[PDB]
Amino acid sequence: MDARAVAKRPRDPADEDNELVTALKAKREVNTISVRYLYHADHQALTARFFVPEGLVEFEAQPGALLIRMETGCDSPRHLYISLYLLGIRASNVSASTRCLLESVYTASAARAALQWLDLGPHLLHRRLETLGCVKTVSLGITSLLTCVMRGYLYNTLKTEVFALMIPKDMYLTWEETRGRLQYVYLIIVYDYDGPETRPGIYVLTSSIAHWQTLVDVARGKFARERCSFVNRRITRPRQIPLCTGVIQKLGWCLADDIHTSFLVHKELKLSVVRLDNFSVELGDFREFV
Amino acid sequence: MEANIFCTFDHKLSIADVGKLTKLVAAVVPIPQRLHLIKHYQLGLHQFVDHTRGYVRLRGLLRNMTLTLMRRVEGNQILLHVPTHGLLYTVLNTGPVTWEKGDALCVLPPLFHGPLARENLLTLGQWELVLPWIVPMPLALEINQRLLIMGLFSLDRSYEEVKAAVQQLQTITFRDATFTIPDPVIDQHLLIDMKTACLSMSMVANLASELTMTYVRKLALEDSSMLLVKCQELLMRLDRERSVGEPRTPARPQHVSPDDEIARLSALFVMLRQLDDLIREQVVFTVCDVSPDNKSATCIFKG
Amino acid sequence: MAAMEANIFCTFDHKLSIADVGKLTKLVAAVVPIPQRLHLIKHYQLGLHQFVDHTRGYVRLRGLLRNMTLTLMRRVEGNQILLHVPTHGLLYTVLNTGPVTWEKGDALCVLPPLFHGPLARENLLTLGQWELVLPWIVPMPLALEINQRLLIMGLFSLDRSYEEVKAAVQQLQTITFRDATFTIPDPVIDQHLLIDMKTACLSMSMVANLASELTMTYVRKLALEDSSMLLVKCQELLMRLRPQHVSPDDEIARLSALFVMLRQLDDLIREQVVFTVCDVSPDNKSATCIFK
Amino acid sequence: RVASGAGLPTSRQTTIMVTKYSEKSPITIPFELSAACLTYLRETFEGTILDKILNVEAMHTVLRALKNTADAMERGLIHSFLQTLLRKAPPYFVVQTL
């Protein structure tokens, strides 16, 4: 081959005409559609359309929320897309005032019954849950078309605006007074153990730690209270087999400096939340720890 | 242009056989080692098929094998392409179980059952193109637990209770289609792979007993997290509240050789390393949207 | 600030000889951990050397590297040093440092260096009472052995008298692998290693409770009727001289928690892969990798 | 065939037809180029006397790889062709018996 084939600078797609234009330029046809600049041709982010019942449109109508699929023992619907905020009423982490606050908004023909699917089972919630990503461009309707972000930065179409993730203040915690310039986000479910039933809490933990070994070690200190309940239930209840004090999982990373407290106001109701700004998405598997 | 992996055959190909490859335009294909050219013998999982070796040997080799999706079937060539991490990649639903949106799919070696059903698509002269199953992650955790319990019962068999309990583990039941998992045991005697694996759990289940006793009593003196005192009584191993037999403390090792005690710890973790391949299931794809009739679905690559 | 840079420039402040600068050309594509990530870094921050302590504890040095960001070496000039952060998933090429067989297809994990059998060790570089130190990249089976034996050193020290412990350490410092001896730089029992036991000590007892009544007896079931090399050999290692509960619905879930402890107990010696070899060079002066 | 006398079996016509097939054996040549040699062959810096020299070696190095790749293509064509003949060649004592 010629040396020009290797000495050449890499081809610029912007220097090339759009592929739809090439078919038109060869025949000089003029369709009513303007293909001279395709929209959404440049997106590192990945997305998927999610048709959702209208009873879960609340709060998510503002972009930036953690969708999580919830498989249910019923064979239809097979996979309801619970909002992370809707799961907070189940959480013991939420303050009793905050629990009574948002819960009034969630009454619906469907969402109010969605909580019943959690209570019925015996197995732990993380076996049902599966993280999906983050909201962008809600369709708003009787069957709203949520657009999840599997990976990459959230942003408005045509890069007009960078959407921010909304993490509720009650679930948030810090591992250090002096954050590093980078800190990965980790959604975490914690299973405290009690007689009749477990009453799990929810946590989101930005941390400069990245390696999994050092990450779980600091959690073994702060959650040692539930850890004491974990071994205590084991000696208490043979045949019963509780497992996992908690479940770390990677969710993304943020620049730390961009973080600042904020609040969402749906249906004229303030709700203070931590607000990651330029938050790239990097989801990972659930990682059980004892 | 795009990077590709050519994989020409050797046996003559009927034109009708090439049309079966047109049904496999985009499906997972294991490869023993990355190369720019691969013989069709190396192609597929069939290169590592074994007789006496059990399912564990396939999974232990397949985890090291590099995945590679099909791109464009052509004449004498095969255009394989290795997925890049962080990008979406459609996969054919070769897996018996129907896919669901958002699941973390992960490769497992095939487990064809008793009676004949779906046939291998390419029986090209003795060699045949088997493919690994694509399964959702929660089921992959489930199938691995089934075979190991069936190996725990590989010894005892004459009793009716074990004879029925294996039949229940043999029959999985899940959403939509149900399936049956073949018994690793054959002709009474166990396959060597399950025997190497079942003993690897049996070592940790028993060697950990006496060895951990001395290490609990000393570290528990600090009463830091306080749980270590409860950990000391965890080792009594019982359900009923036994009364006045008077060994309330767990039994402890005695008269061990000073050097052999070190070797017993070396004999402990080495069993964990042989056992590790069954312990974990790395994700390889994460499906987003699913095509109707579950024929195929887009999946971002992982790993 | 801006996302931590993929490309990092390090400039040496101290004067360096014309001979030493050519060693950096031989040092190209080395794995160079860095502390804080920044577009321009002082050379004193560069390398592993600043974390050394008078205690010279190896167990802490193994931990601190795992929080550090690895950066491959690239393109040395007359002073500029073009460190390049490896973004995940790309197929990087990695020049080797420590003498080891490597061999294609092994997983890799960065570890602090283990001095060779002569005990002689010329420094890779020196610069004004300061020495560059690049942690070794090792095959995964090698990393599992070097990491577990330190845990054996801690548990053994918990009981037996200090005189017998130190004599055992010389038996433990050696680690043959691929016909190549290695030795730990001053292994130490310490609070950094004391926590390695407590996370293990709780991990051990949980397996004894999660174990099935059959699984503890399963090896004894085999010796009663069969015999083999692995069976007879393990029988000396531990045991002293029909199931009662046929509950498949219990065992299917009882092991499910037992697999959790097997994940946690392995993680004390398991570490995240940093690279995955494809084809070691026949010269064995370079290697091909991915992961990140 | 051949004519034969009376009282003997004859030789009815025996048409015979056969079809040959074909084999295949593609080859490939990897070759490496240093990323610096590419970036110097591509971008051109200030016209300093030293950079022009390094740019000249960067240009010749690509020809050293291409011509080596072409000669390797011929060595492999001879190698794959001779490897093809060796599979087709019977051991001599069989050909002598035939």
Coordinates of C-alpha atoms in Angstrom, one line a residue, chain A residues 5-284:
Chain A
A5 CA -2.5 5.4 3.4
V6 CA -0.5 5.4 6.7
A7 CA 1.0 8.9 6.8
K8 CA -2.5 10.5 6.6
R9 CA -4.1 12.2 9.5
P10 CA -7.1 10.4 10.9
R11 CA -10.3 11.1 8.9
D12 CA -12.6 13.8 10.4
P13 CA -16.3 12.8 10.2
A14 CA -17.2 16.5 10.1
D15 CA -15.1 17.0 7.0
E16 CA -17.1 14.1 5.4
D17 CA -20.6 14.8 4.2
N18 CA -23.5 13.1 6.0
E19 CA -24.3 9.7 4.6
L20 CA -27.8 10.6 3.7
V21 CA -26.4 13.6 1.8
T22 CA -24.2 11.4 -0.3
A23 CA -27.1 9.4 -1.7
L24 CA -28.9 12.7 -2.5
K25 CA -25.8 14.4 -3.9
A26 CA -25.3 11.6 -6.4
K27 CA -28.8 12.1 -7.8
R28 CA -29.2 15.9 -6.9
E29 CA -32.6 15.1 -5.4
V30 CA -34.0 17.6 -2.8
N31 CA -36.1 15.9 -0.2
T32 CA -38.2 18.1 2.2
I33 CA -36.2 16.7 5.1
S34 CA -33.0 18.6 5.9
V35 CA -30.3 15.9 6.2
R36 CA -27.4 18.4 5.8
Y37 CA -26.9 18.1 9.6
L38 CA -28.2 15.0 11.4
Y39 CA -29.2 15.6 14.9
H40 CA -27.8 13.4 17.8
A41 CA -25.0 12.3 15.5
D42 CA -22.4 12.9 18.3
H43 CA -23.2 11.2 21.7
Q44 CA -20.9 9.2 23.8
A45 CA -23.9 8.6 26.1
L46 CA -26.2 5.5 25.6
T47 CA -29.9 5.5 26.2
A48 CA -33.0 3.4 26.0
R49 CA -36.7 4.2 25.8
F50 CA -38.8 3.0 28.8
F51 CA -42.6 3.0 28.7
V52 CA -43.9 3.6 32.2
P53 CA -47.3 3.9 34.0
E54 CA -48.5 7.4 34.6
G55 CA -48.6 6.8 38.4
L56 CA -44.8 7.0 38.7
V57 CA -44.3 10.2 36.6
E58 CA -43.9 12.3 39.8
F59 CA -40.5 13.8 40.7
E60 CA -38.9 12.1 37.7
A61 CA -40.5 14.8 35.5
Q62 CA -37.5 16.8 36.6
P63 CA -34.6 15.2 34.8
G64 CA -32.1 13.3 37.0
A65 CA -33.3 10.2 39.0
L66 CA -32.2 6.6 39.5
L67 CA -34.5 4.3 37.8
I68 CA -34.4 0.7 39.1
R69 CA -36.2 -2.3 37.6
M70 CA -38.2 -4.4 40.1
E71 CA -39.1 -7.9 39.0
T72 CA -42.2 -9.2 40.7
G73 CA -43.6 -12.7 41.4
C74 CA -46.6 -11.8 39.2
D75 CA -46.1 -12.8 35.6
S76 CA -47.8 -9.5 34.3
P77 CA -46.4 -6.8 34.5
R78 CA -43.1 -8.6 34.8
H79 CA -40.8 -5.6 35.4
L80 CA -42.1 -2.4 36.9
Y81 CA -39.7 0.6 36.8
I82 CA -39.7 1.8 40.4
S83 CA -38.5 5.3 41.1
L84 CA -35.7 5.6 43.6
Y85 CA -37.7 8.1 45.6
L86 CA -40.7 5.8 45.6
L87 CA -38.5 3.2 47.3
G88 CA -37.6 5.6 50.1
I89 CA -40.8 4.9 52.0
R90 CA -39.6 1.3 52.4
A91 CA -36.3 2.7 53.6
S92 CA -35.6 3.2 57.3
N93 CA -33.0 5.8 56.4
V94 CA -35.7 8.4 55.6
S95 CA -36.7 10.8 58.4
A96 CA -40.2 10.3 59.7
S97 CA -41.1 13.8 58.7
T98 CA -39.7 13.3 55.2
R99 CA -41.4 9.9 55.0
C100 CA -44.8 11.5 55.6
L101 CA -43.9 14.3 53.3
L102 CA -43.3 12.7 49.9
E103 CA -45.6 9.7 50.6
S104 CA -48.8 11.8 50.0
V105 CA -47.6 12.5 46.4
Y106 CA -47.4 8.9 45.5
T107 CA -51.0 7.9 45.9
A108 CA -52.2 6.5 42.6
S109 CA -54.2 3.7 41.0
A110 CA -50.9 1.9 40.5
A111 CA -48.0 3.4 42.4
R112 CA -49.8 3.2 45.7
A113 CA -50.2 -0.6 45.2
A114 CA -46.6 -0.9 44.0
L115 CA -45.3 -0.9 47.6
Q116 CA -47.3 -4.1 48.2
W117 CA -45.1 -6.1 45.9
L118 CA -42.1 -5.5 48.2
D119 CA -43.7 -6.7 51.4
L120 CA -45.1 -10.0 50.1
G121 CA -41.8 -11.7 49.4
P122 CA -39.3 -13.4 51.7
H123 CA -36.1 -12.7 49.8
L124 CA -34.1 -9.5 50.2
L125 CA -34.8 -6.5 48.0
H126 CA -31.5 -6.4 46.2
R127 CA -32.3 -9.7 44.5
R128 CA -35.3 -8.0 42.9
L129 CA -33.8 -4.6 42.2
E130 CA -31.5 -3.8 39.2
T131 CA -30.1 -0.4 38.6
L132 CA -30.9 1.2 35.2
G133 CA -29.5 4.7 35.1
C134 CA -30.9 8.3 35.0
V135 CA -33.7 10.3 33.6
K136 CA -33.7 12.6 30.6
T137 CA -36.4 14.2 28.5
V138 CA -39.6 12.8 30.1
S139 CA -42.5 12.5 27.6
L140 CA -45.3 13.1 30.2
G141 CA -48.5 11.3 29.5
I142 CA -50.8 8.4 30.4
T143 CA -47.9 6.2 29.5
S144 CA -44.8 8.4 29.9
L145 CA -41.7 7.6 27.8
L146 CA -38.8 7.9 30.2
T147 CA -35.3 7.9 28.6
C148 CA -32.8 6.1 30.8
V149 CA -29.0 6.9 30.5
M150 CA -27.1 3.6 30.6
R151 CA -23.7 5.3 30.3
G152 CA -22.2 8.8 29.8
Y153 CA -23.1 12.3 31.0
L154 CA -26.7 13.4 31.3
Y155 CA -27.5 16.3 29.1
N156 CA -30.3 18.1 27.2
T157 CA -30.6 17.4 23.4
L158 CA -28.3 19.4 21.2
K159 CA -26.1 19.8 24.4
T160 CA -28.2 22.8 25.4
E161 CA -27.9 21.9 29.1
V162 CA -26.3 19.3 31.4
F163 CA -28.8 17.6 33.5
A164 CA -27.9 17.0 37.2
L165 CA -28.5 13.9 39.3
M166 CA -30.8 14.4 42.3
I167 CA -29.7 12.4 45.4
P168 CA -32.0 12.9 48.5
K169 CA -30.3 14.4 51.5
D170 CA -31.4 11.8 54.0
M171 CA -29.7 8.9 52.2
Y172 CA -26.4 10.8 51.6
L173 CA -23.3 10.5 53.7
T174 CA -19.6 11.5 53.5
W175 CA -16.5 9.4 54.3
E176 CA -14.1 12.4 54.7
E177 CA -14.1 16.1 55.5
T178 CA -11.7 16.7 52.7
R179 CA -12.9 15.1 49.4
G180 CA -10.6 14.3 46.6
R181 CA -10.9 15.9 43.2
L182 CA -12.5 12.7 41.9
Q183 CA -15.0 10.5 43.9
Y184 CA -17.0 7.5 42.6
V185 CA -20.7 7.2 43.5
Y186 CA -21.9 4.0 45.2
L187 CA -25.5 3.2 45.8
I188 CA -25.8 0.9 48.8
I189 CA -28.6 -1.1 50.5
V190 CA -28.0 -1.9 54.1
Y191 CA -29.9 -4.8 55.9
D192 CA -30.3 -4.2 59.6
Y193 CA -31.7 -7.3 61.2
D194 CA -34.7 -7.5 63.5
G195 CA -37.2 -10.1 64.8
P196 CA -40.3 -10.1 62.5
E197 CA -38.6 -8.7 59.4
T198 CA -35.6 -6.7 58.1
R199 CA -36.1 -3.0 57.6
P200 CA -33.5 -2.0 55.1
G201 CA -32.1 1.5 54.6
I202 CA -30.7 3.1 51.5
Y203 CA -27.5 5.1 51.1
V204 CA -25.6 6.9 48.4
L205 CA -21.9 7.4 49.1
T206 CA -19.5 9.6 47.1
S207 CA -16.0 8.7 48.0
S208 CA -12.4 9.2 46.7
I209 CA -11.9 5.5 47.2
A210 CA -12.0 3.5 44.0
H211 CA -10.4 0.1 44.8
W212 CA -13.0 -2.4 46.1
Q213 CA -10.8 -3.7 48.9
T214 CA -10.3 -0.4 50.6
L215 CA -13.9 0.6 49.9
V216 CA -15.6 -2.1 51.9
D217 CA -13.2 -1.8 54.8
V218 CA -14.4 1.7 55.9
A219 CA -18.0 0.4 55.6
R220 CA -17.2 -2.3 58.1
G221 CA -16.7 0.4 60.7
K222 CA -19.6 2.7 60.1
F223 CA -22.1 -0.1 59.6
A224 CA -20.7 -2.3 62.5
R225 CA -23.9 -1.7 64.4
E226 CA -25.9 -3.6 61.8
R227 CA -23.0 -6.0 61.5
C228 CA -23.4 -6.9 65.1
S229 CA -27.1 -7.5 64.4
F230 CA -26.1 -9.7 61.5
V231 CA -24.1 -12.2 63.6
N232 CA -26.6 -11.9 66.4
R233 CA -29.5 -13.1 64.2
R234 CA -27.4 -16.1 63.1
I235 CA -26.8 -17.4 66.6
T236 CA -30.5 -16.6 67.4
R237 CA -32.3 -18.3 64.5
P238 CA -31.0 -21.5 63.2
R239 CA -32.7 -22.7 59.9
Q240 CA -33.2 -19.0 59.2
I241 CA -30.3 -17.9 57.0
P242 CA -29.9 -14.1 56.8
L243 CA -27.2 -13.0 54.5
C244 CA -25.2 -9.8 53.6
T245 CA -25.1 -6.8 55.9
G246 CA -25.2 -4.7 52.8
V247 CA -24.6 -4.5 49.0
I248 CA -22.2 -1.9 47.5
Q249 CA -22.4 -1.2 43.8
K250 CA -20.7 1.3 41.5
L251 CA -23.0 3.9 40.0
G252 CA -20.8 6.6 38.6
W253 CA -18.3 9.3 39.3
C254 CA -18.3 13.1 39.8
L255 CA -15.9 16.0 40.0
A256 CA -16.7 16.7 43.6
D257 CA -16.1 20.5 43.2
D258 CA -19.4 20.8 41.3
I259 CA -21.5 19.3 44.1
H260 CA -23.8 21.6 46.0
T261 CA -27.1 21.2 48.0
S262 CA -30.3 21.8 46.1
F263 CA -34.0 21.0 46.3
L264 CA -36.8 19.8 43.9
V265 CA -40.3 21.2 44.1
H266 CA -42.9 18.9 42.6
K267 CA -46.6 19.7 43.4
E268 CA -45.5 22.8 45.4
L269 CA -43.5 20.7 47.8
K270 CA -39.9 21.4 48.6
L271 CA -37.5 18.4 48.9
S272 CA -33.9 19.1 49.7
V273 CA -31.5 16.9 47.8
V274 CA -27.8 16.5 47.1
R275 CA -27.2 17.6 43.5
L276 CA -24.3 16.1 41.5
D277 CA -23.6 18.3 38.5
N278 CA -21.5 16.9 35.7
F279 CA -22.2 13.3 36.6
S280 CA -21.0 10.6 34.2
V281 CA -22.7 7.2 34.5
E282 CA -20.6 4.0 35.1
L283 CA -23.0 1.3 36.4
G284 CA -21.7 -2.0 37.9

